[PDB]
Coordinates of C-alpha atoms and ligand atoms in Angstrom, one line a residue:
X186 CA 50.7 -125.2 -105.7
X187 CA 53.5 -127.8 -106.4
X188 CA 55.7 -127.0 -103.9
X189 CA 56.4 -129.6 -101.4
X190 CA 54.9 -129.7 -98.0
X191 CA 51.9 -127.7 -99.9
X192 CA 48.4 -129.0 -99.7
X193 CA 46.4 -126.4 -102.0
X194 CA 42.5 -126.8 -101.6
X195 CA 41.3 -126.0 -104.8
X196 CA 37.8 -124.7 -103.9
X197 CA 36.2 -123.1 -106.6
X198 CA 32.5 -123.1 -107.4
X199 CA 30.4 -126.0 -109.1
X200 CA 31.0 -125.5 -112.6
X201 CA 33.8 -123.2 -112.8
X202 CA 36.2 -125.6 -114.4
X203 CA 38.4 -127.1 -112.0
X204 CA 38.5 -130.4 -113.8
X205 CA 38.5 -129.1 -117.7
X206 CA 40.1 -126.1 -117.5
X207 CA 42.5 -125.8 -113.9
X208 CA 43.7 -129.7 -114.5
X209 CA 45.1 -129.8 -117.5
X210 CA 47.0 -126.8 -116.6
X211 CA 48.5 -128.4 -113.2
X212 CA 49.2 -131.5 -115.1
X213 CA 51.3 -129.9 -117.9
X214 CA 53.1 -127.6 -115.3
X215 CA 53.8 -131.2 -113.3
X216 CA 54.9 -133.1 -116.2
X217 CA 57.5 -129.9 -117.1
X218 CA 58.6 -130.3 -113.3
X219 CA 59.4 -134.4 -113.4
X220 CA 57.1 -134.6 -110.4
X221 CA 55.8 -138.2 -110.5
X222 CA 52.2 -137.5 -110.2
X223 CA 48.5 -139.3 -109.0
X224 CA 45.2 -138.1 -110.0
X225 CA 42.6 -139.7 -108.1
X226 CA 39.0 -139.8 -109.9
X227 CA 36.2 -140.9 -107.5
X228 CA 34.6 -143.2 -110.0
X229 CA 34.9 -144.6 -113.4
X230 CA 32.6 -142.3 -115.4
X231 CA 34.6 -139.4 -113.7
X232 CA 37.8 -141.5 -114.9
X233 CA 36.7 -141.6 -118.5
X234 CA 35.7 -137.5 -118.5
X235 CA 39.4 -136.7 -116.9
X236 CA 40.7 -138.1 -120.3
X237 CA 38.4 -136.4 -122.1
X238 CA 39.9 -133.2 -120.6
X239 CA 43.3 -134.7 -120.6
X240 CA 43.2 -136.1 -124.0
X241 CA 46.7 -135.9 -125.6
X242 CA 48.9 -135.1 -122.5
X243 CA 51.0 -138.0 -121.1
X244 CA 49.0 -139.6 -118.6
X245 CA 48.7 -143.5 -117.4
X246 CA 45.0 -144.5 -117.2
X247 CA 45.1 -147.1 -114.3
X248 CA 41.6 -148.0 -115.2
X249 CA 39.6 -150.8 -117.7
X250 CA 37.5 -147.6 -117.5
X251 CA 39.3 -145.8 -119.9
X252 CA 40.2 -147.0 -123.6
X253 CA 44.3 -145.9 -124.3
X254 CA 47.3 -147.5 -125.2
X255 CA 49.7 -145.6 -123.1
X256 CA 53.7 -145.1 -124.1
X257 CA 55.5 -146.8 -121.0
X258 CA 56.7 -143.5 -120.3
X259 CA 54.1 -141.3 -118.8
X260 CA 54.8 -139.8 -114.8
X261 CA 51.7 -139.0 -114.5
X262 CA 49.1 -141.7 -113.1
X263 CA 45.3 -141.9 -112.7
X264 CA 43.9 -144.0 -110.9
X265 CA 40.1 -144.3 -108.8
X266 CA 40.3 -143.1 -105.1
X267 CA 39.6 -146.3 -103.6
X268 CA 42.0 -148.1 -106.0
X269 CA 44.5 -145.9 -104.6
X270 CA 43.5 -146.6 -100.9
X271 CA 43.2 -150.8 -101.9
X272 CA 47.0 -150.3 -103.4
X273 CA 48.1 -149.2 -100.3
X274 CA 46.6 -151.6 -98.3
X275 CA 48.1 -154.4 -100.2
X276 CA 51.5 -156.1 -100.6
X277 CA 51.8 -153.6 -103.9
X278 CA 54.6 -150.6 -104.2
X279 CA 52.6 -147.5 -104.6
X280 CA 55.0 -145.0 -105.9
X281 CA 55.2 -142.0 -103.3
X282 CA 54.0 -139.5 -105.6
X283 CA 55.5 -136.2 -105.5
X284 CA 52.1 -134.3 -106.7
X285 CA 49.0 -136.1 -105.1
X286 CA 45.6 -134.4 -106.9
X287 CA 42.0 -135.9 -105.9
X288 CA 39.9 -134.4 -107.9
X289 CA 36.2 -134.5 -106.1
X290 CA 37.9 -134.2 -103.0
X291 CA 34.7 -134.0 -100.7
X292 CA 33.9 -137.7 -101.3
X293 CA 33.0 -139.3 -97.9
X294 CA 33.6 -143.2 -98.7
X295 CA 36.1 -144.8 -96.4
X296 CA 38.3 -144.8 -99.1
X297 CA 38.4 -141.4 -100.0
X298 CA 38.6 -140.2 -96.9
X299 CA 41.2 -142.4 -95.8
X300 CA 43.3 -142.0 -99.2
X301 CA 43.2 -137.5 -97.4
X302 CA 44.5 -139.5 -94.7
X303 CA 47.5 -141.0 -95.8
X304 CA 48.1 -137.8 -98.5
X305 CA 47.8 -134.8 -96.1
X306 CA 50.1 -137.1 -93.6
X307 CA 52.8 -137.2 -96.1
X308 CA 52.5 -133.1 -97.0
X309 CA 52.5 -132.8 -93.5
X310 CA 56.2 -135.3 -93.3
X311 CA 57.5 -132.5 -95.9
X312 CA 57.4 -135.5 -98.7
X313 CA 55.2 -134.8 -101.0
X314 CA 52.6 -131.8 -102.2
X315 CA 48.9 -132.2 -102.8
X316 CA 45.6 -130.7 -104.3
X317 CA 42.1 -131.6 -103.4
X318 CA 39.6 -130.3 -105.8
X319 CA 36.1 -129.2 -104.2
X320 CA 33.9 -126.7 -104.2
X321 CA 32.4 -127.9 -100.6
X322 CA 35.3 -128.9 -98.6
X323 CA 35.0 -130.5 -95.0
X324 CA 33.3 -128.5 -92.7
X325 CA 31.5 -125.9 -95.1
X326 CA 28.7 -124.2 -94.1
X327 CA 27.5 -122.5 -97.0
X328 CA 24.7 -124.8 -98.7
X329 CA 24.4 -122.3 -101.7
X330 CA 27.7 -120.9 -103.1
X331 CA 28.1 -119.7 -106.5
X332 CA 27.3 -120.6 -109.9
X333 CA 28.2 -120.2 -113.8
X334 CA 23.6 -118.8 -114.2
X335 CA 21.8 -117.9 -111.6
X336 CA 19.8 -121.0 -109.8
X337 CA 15.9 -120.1 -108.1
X338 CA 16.1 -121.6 -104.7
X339 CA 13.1 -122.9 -103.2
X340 CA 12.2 -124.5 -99.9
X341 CA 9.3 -126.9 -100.5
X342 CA 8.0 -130.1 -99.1
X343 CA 9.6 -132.9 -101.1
X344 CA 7.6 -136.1 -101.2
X345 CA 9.6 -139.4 -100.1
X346 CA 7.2 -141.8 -100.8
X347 CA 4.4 -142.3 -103.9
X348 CA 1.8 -139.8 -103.8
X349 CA -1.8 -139.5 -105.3
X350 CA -1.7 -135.5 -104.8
X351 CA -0.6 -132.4 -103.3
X352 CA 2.8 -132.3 -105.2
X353 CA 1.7 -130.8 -108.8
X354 CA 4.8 -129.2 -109.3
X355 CA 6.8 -132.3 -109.4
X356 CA 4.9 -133.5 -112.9
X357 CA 3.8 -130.1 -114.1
X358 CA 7.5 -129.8 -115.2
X359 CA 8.3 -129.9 -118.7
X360 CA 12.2 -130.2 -118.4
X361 CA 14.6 -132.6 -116.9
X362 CA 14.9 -132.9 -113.4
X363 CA 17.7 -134.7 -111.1
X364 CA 16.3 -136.2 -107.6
X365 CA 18.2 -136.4 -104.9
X366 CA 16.4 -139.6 -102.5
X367 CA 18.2 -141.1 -99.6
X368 CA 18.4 -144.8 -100.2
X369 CA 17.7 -147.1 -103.2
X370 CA 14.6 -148.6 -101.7
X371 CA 12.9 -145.1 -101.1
X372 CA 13.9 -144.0 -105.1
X373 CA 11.9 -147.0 -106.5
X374 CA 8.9 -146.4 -104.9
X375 CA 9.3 -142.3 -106.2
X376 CA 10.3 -144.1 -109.3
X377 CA 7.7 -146.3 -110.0
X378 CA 5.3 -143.7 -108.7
X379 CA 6.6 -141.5 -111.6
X380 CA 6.3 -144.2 -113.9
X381 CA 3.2 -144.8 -113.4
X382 CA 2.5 -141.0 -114.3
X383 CA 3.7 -141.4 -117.7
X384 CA 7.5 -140.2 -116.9
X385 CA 10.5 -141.8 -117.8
X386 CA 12.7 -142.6 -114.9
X387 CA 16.5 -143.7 -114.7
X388 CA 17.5 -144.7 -111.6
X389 CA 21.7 -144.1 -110.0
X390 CA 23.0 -145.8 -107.0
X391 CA 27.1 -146.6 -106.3
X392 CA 26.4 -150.6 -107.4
X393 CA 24.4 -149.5 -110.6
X394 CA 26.1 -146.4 -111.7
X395 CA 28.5 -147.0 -114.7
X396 CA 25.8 -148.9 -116.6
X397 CA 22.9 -146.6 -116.0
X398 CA 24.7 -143.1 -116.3
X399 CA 25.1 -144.3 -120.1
X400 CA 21.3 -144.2 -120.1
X401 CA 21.4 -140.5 -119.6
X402 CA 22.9 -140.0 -122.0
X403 CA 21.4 -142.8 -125.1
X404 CA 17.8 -142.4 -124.2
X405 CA 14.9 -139.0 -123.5
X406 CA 14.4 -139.5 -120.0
X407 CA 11.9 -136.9 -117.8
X408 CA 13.5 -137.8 -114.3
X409 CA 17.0 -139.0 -112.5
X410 CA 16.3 -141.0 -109.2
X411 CA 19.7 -140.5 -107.6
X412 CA 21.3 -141.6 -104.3
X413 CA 24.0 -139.2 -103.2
X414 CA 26.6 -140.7 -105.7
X415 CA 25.5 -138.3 -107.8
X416 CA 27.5 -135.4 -105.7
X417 CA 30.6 -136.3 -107.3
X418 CA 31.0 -135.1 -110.5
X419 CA 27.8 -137.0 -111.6
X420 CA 26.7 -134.2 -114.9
X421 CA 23.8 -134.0 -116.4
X422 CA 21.5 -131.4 -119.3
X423 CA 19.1 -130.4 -116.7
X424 CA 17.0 -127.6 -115.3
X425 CA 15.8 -128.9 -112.0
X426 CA 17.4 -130.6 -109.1
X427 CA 15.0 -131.7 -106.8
X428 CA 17.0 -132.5 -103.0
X429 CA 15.1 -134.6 -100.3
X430 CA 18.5 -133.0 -98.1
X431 CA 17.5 -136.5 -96.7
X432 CA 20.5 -139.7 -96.7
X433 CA 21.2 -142.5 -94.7
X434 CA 24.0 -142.7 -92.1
X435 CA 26.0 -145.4 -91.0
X436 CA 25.8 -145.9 -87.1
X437 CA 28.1 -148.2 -85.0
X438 CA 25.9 -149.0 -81.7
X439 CA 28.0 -150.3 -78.8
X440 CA 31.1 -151.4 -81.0
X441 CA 28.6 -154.2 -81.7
X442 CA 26.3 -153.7 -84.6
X443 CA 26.0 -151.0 -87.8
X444 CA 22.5 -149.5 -88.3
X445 CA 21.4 -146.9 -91.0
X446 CA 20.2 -144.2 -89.2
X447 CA 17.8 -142.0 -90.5
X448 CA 16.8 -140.8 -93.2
X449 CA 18.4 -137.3 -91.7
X450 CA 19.3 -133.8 -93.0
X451 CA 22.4 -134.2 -95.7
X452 CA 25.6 -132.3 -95.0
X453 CA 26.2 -128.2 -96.1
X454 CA 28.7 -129.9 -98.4
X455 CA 26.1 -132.7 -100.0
X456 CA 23.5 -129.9 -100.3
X457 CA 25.7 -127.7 -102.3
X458 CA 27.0 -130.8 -104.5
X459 CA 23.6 -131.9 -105.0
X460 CA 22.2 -128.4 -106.2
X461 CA 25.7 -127.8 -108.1
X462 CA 24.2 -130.6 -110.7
X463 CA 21.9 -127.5 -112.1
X464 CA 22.8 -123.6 -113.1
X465 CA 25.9 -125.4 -114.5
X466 CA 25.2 -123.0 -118.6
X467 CA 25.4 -119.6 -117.9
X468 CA 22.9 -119.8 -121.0
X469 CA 20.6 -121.1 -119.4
X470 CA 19.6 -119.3 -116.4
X471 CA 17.2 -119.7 -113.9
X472 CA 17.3 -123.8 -113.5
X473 CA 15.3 -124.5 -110.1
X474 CA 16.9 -126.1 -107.0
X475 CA 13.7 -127.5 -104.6
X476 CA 14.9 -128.7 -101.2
X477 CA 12.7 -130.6 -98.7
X478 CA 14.8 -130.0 -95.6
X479 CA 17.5 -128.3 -93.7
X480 CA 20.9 -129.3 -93.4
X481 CA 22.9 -130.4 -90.6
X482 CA 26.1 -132.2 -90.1
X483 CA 25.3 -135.8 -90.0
X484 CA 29.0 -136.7 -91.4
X485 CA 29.7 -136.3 -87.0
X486 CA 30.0 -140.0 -85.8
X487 CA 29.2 -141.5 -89.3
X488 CA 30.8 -144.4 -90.1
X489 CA 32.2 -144.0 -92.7
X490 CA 35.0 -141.9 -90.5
X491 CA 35.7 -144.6 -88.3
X492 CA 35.8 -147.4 -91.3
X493 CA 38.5 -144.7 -92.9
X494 CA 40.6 -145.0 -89.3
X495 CA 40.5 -148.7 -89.9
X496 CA 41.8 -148.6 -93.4
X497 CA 44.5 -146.3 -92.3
X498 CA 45.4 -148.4 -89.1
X499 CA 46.6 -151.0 -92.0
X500 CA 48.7 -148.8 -94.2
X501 CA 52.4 -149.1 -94.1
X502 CA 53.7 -145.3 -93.8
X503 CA 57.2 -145.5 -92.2
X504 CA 58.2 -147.7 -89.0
X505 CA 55.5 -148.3 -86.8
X506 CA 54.2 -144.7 -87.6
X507 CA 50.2 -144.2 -88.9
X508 CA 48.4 -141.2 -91.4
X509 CA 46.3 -139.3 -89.3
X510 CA 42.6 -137.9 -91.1
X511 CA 43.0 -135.0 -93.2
X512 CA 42.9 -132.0 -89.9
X513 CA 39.3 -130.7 -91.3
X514 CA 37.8 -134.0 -90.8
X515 CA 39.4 -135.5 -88.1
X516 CA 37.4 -134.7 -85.4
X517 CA 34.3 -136.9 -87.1
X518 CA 35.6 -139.9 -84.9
X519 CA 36.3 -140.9 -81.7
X520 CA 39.4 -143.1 -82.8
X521 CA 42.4 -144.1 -80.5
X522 CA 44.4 -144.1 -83.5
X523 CA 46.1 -147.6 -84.4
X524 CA 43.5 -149.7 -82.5
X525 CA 42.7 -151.0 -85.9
X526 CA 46.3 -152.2 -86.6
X527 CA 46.0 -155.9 -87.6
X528 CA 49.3 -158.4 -87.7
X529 CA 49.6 -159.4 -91.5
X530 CA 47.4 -162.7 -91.6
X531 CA 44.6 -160.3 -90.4
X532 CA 45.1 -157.6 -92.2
X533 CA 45.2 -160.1 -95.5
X534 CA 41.9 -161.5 -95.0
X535 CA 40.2 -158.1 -94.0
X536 CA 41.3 -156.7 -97.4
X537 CA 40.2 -159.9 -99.3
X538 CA 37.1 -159.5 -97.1
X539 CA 36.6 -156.2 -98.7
X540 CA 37.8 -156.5 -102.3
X541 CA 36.7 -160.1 -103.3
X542 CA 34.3 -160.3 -100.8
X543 CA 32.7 -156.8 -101.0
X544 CA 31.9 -156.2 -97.5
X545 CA 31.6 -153.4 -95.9
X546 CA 35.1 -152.1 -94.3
X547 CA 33.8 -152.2 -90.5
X548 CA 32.0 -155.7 -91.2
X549 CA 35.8 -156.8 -92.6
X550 CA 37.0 -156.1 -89.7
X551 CA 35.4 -157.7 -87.1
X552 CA 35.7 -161.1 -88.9
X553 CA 39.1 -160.5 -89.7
X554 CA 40.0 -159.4 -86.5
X555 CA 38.2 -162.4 -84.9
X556 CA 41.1 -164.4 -86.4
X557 CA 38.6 -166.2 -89.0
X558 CA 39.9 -167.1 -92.6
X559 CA 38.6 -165.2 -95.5
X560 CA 36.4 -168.6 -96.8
X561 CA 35.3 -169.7 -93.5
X562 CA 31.2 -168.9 -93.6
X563 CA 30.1 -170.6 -90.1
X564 CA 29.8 -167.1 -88.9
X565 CA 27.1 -166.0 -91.4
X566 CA 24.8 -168.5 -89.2
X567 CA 26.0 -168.2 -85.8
X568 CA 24.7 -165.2 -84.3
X569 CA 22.1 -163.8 -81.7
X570 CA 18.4 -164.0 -82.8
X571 CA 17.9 -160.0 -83.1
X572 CA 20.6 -160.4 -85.8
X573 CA 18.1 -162.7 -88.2
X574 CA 18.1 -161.0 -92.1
X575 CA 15.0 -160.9 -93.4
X576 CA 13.4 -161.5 -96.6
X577 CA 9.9 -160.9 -97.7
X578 CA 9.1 -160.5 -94.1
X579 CA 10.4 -164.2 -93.1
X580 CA 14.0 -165.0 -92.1
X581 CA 16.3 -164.8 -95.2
X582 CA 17.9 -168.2 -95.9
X583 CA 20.6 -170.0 -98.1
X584 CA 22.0 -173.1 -98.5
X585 CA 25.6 -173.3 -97.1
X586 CA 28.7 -174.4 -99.1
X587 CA 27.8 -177.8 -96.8
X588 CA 24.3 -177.7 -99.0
X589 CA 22.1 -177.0 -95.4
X590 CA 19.6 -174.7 -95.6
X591 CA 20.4 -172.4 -92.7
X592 CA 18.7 -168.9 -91.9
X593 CA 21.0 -165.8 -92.1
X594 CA 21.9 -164.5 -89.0
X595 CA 25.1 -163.6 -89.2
X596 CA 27.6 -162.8 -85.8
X597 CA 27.8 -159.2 -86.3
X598 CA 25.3 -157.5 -87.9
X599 CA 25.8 -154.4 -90.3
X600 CA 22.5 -153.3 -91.9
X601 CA 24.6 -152.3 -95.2
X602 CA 25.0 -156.3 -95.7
X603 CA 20.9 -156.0 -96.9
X604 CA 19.8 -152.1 -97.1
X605 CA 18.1 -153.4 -100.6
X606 CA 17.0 -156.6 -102.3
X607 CA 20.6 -156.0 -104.7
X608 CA 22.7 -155.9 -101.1
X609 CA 20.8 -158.9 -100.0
X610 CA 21.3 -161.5 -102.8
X611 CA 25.5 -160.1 -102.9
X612 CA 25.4 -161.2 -99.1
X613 CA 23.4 -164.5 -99.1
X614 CA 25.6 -165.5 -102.2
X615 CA 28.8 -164.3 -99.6
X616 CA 27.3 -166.4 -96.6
X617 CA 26.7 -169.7 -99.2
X618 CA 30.3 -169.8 -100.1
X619 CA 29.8 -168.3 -103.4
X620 CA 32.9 -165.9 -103.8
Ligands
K2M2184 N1 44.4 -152.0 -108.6 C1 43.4 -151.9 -109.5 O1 42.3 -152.3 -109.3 N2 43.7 -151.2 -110.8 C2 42.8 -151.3 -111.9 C3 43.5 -151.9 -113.1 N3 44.9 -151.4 -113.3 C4 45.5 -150.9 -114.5 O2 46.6 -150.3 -114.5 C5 44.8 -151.2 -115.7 C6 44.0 -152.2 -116.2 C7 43.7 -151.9 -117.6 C8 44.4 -150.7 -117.8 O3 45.0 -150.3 -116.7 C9 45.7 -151.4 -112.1 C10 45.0 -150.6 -111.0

C-alpha cells in the first residue's frame, strides 16, 4: 500500500478491524519506512479511540481531544479531517505527507470530501501515497455487505413523528436500539414520544456529539436518537438499529438560496453505515436492522459537493494549479473548477467566516465573495422579504451590534443558518455581532 502514486481503498466490512487491527499495522510499517505520515479521524471521539488502538506507537495527537504528552519526535501525525482541510486553507505549512490515511473515508462533509480532493490529486502528481478506510466507498450499491454475526433484515414502516399506535415493535423491545432520524427537529419529537413511554433516550447530532456520546457510555439508556453523524465510526453495545433511510439534503436553488430538501431516501453507503452500528459481536448474533425506506443516491447535486469545490478552489497546490474531487465522486457537481478561487482578502474572511464564524461553507462564500469584511453584519438585515427567519412562527429578531432591534432576514439565505432552535440562536448571536 505505501508505495507512492498508490491510493489503496481499504474496503473491508463494518466491523472487521480496519481501525484496531489493519492501522496499527500500516502505521508501524510507515514509521519503519520514515514516511512522514497523516491520519485523519472524522471527529474527536473517533480521535480519542485511534489512540486507544495506537496506544504506545509514536504518533502526534493534533487534537485537545486526546490526553498525551508527545516526544517532539514522532512522523506520524493525527489530526480531524476538517482540521486538515482548515490547515490547508490557511496561511499554515501543512507538511506534504508522504502517507495520507483517512480513516472513515466515506464522510460526506465539505471537508472530508474536499481533504479526497486535495489527497487523491497529489497520488495522482506521483507525490505522495494514500489509504481511505471504508467499508461503503463512493458510489456503492450494496446497502447490506457483510458482517462479524449475522444481522435479521427487515423492511418495515418506521414512524417519523410521535405515535399513539400501530408501531408495537418499536417499545416491545427489551434491548438497545440505535435510531437513525433525519434532522434534529424530527429526533425530539420521536424522542420525547419515547420518553413519554417510559424509555430513556439520548439524543446525537454533529453540534452535540462529544458530550452526549459520553452518555452512552455513563448511563442505562433504552434508545439512541441519531442524525447521520452516527455513520462514522459512531459504536455502540446494541442489538437493533432502527433506519428511517430518511436525511436531509442540502439544495442550492438558482445560485441564489440553500434549502434542505427532503427528508429523502439515504445513500447505499449511509444505509450500510447506519446498519454497520449492529451485528458488530460475532457472539451475539441475530441483532435486527428495521429500515423504513429504500435507498437512492441523494449525494447527486447535494451541496455538500459543491461547498467541497469551493474549499478546494482556495487551496494552494502548486502555481495556479487546483485538486480536482476524488474521481469516484466527482461527478456529484456541476463545478467549472476554480470558479470559487478568491484573491487573498477574500479568501481570509471566507475562512474566518467559517472557523470563527461557523457558517456554513457556501453561506461563507457569498459574503466573502461579495467583498464584505468578516465583522461587517448589515447583511444579516438587508435582504428580500421571502428571506425573513422565523421564530415561534413570527419573524426572528435581534438587536444589532448598533443595539436596534432589526428582524433577520439576511441577503442570502441558507436554511442550515436555522434548521433547529440550536442553529438559530448560533446565527442570531452571528447577525448581533456577537463573535
Ligand atoms: N488546527 C487545529 O485546530 N488543531 C487542533 C489543535 N492542534 C494541536 O496540535 C493540539 C492542541 C493540543 C494538542 O495538540 C493543532 C491542530
Amino acid at each position: 500500500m505505501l508505495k507512492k502514486k498508490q491510493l489503496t481503498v481499504l474496503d473491508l466490512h463494518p466491523g472487521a478491524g480496519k481501525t484496531r487491527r489493519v492501522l496499527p499495522e500500516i502505521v508501524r510499517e510507515a514509521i519503519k519506512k520514515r514516511l512522514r505520515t497523516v491520519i485523519l479521524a472524522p471527529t474527536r471521539v473517533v480521535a480519542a479511540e485511534m489512540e486507544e488502538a495506537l496506544r504506545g506507537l509514536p504518533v502526534r495527537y493534533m487534537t485537545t481531544a486526546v490526553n498525551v504528552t508527545h516526544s517532539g519526535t514522532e512522523i506520524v501525525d493525527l489530526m480531524c479531517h476538517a482540521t486538515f482541510t482548515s490547515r490547508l486553507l490557511q496561511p499554515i505549512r501543512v507538511p506534504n505527507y508522504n502517507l495520507n490515511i483517512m480513516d472513515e473515508a466515506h464522510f460526506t462533509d465539505p471537508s472530508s470530501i474536499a481533504a479526497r480532493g486535495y489527497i487523491s490529486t497529489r497520488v495522482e502528481m506521483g507525490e505522495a501515497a494514500a489509504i481511505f478506510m471504508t467499508a461503503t466507498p463512493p458510489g456503492t450499491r450494496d446497502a447490506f455487505p457483510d458482517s462479524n454475526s449475522p444481522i435479521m433484515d427487515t423492511e418495515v414502516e418506521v414512524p417519523e413523528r410521535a405515535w399513539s399506535s400501530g408501531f408495537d415493535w418499536v417499545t416491545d423491545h427489551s434491548g438497545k436500539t440505535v435510531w437513525f432520524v433525519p434532522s434534529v427537529r424530527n429526533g425530539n419529537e420521536i424522542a420525547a414520544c419515547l420518553t413519554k413511554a417510559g424509555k430513556r433516550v439520548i439524543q446525537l447530532s454533529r453540534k452535540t456529539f462529544e458530550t452526549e456520546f459520553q452518555k452512552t457510555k455513563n448511563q442505562e439508556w433504552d434508545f439512541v436518537i441519531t442524525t447521520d453523524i452516527s455513520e462514522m465510526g459512531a459504536n455502540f453495545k446494541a442489538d437493533r438499529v432502527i433506519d428511517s433511510r430518511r436525511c436531509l439534503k442540502p439544495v442550492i436553488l438558482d445560485g441564489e438560496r440553500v434549502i434542505l430538501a427532503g427528508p429523502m431516501p439515504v445513500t447505499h453507503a449511509s444505509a450500510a453505515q447506519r446498519r454497520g452500528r449492529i451485528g458488530r459481536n460475532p457472539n451475539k448474533p441475530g441483532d435486527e436492522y428495521m429500515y423504513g425506506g429504500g435507498c437512492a443516491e441523494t449525494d447527486e447535486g447535494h451541496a455538500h459537493w459543491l461547498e467541497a469545490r469551493m474549499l478546494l478552489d482556495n487551496i494552494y497546490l502548486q502555481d495556479g494549479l487546483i485538486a480536482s474531487l476524488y474521481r469516484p465522486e466527482a461527478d456529484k457537481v456541476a463545478a467549472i473548477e476554480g470558479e470559487f478561487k478568491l484573491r487573498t482578502e477574500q479568501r481570509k474572511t471566507f475562512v474566518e467566516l467559517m472557523k470563527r464564524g461557523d457558517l456554513p461553507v457556501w453561506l461563507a462564500y457569498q459574503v466573502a465573495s461579495a467583498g464584505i469584511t468578516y465583522t461587517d453584519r448589515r447583511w444579516c438585515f438587508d435582504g428580500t422579504t421571502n428571506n425573513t427567519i422565523m421564530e415561534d412562527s413570527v419573524p426572528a429578531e435581534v438587536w444589532t451590534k448598533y443595539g436596534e432591534k432589526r428582524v433577520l432576514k439576511p441577503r442570502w439565505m441558507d436554511a442550515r443558518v436555522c434548521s433547529d432552535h440550536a442553529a438559530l440562536k448560533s446565527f442570531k448571536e452571528f447577525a448581533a455581532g456577537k463573535r
